Homo-oligomer: A and B are copies of this chain.
Amino acid sequence: NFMIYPISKDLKNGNSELVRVYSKSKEIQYIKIYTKKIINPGTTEEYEVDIPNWDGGLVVTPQKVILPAGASKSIRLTQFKIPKKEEVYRVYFEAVKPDSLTTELSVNIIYAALIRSLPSEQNISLNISRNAKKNIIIYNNGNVRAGVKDIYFCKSSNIDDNCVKKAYNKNIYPEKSFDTLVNNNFSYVFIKLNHEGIEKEQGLIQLKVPL
C-alpha cells in the first residue's frame, strides 16, 4: 500500500512542484507514473488523452519509482510552456510488479492528482447569455476556471432576500458554458465564486440582458 500528497496542485510561472509518494507497507513497492491531459474539463464531453511524461506541455519525472519500506519519494511537475489559458492534467500513480495466488487478496489502487497548469496573469471573467428558453447560461471568458458556489438571481440590482439562491458547486473552465437551468425573468445575477490560491475576489454582478 502507498499514499500520495497533495491530491491536487496548481503550477504557475514555470515553478516546479512536487507530488510525493509515501510508503504505507512493509514491502518494497514499484510505482509507475503516467499522465493524461483532460479535454473539455468540467463538461459533458470531457475525456482524457495519454501524453508522454517528457515531451508534453507538462513534464513529470521520474516515471518509475522504487519505494522501499517506510520511505517517501517525489515526483516533480514542471510546466514546459506556460499556457494562455488554464489546462488540466491528471497524473496517475500505479503500483506494479518489478520489471527486472488464491490465498491473498488482489488489489490495485491507482491514485490520481489533478494538476492545473495556470496562466501567468490570471483573469477571472464571466459572460451571461440566454437559451432557447432564456434559461440563463454562464460563459467563462477568462483564462482560469471559475468555481461557482452559488448564484443569486435578482429582479433588481440589489442583493437581498427577494433573490433566489441556487447552490451550484461547479467549476467552469475557460471557453466553456454552464446551464443554470433557470429561465425565469430576473434582471441581474450575482455569481459566488470559490476561492483559489490566495485569490479572494468575492462578488461578480452581471446584468442579464433583456429577452
Q: How far apart are A54's CB and chain B's nearest CB, in angstroms? A: 23
Interface of A (DSSP majority class):
strand
Please name the residue on chain B nearest to A94 by beta carbon. Answer: B108
* Nearest-Cβ distance from residue A200 to partner chain B, whole angstroms: 17
State A107–B94 Cα separation when bound (angstroms): 11
Total identical chains: 2
Give the contacts of A109-140 with B (CB-CB under 8 A). 109-114, 116
User: Residue of B at shortest CB range from A104?
Assistant: B7
Q: Please measure, in the bound complex, the distance between the C-alpha atom of A11 and the C-alpha atom of B5, giving whole angstroms.
A: 42
* CB of A49 closer than 8 Å to a CB of B: no
- With A8-B101, A102-B116 known, 14 other A-B pairs at CB within 8 A are A7-B105, A7-B106, A8-B102, A8-B103, A101-B114, A102-B171, A105-B111, A106-B112, A107-B111, A108-B111, A108-B112, A109-B109, A109-B110, A110-B110
Chain A residues within CB distance 8 Å of chain B: 7-8, 90, 101-114, 116, 171, 196
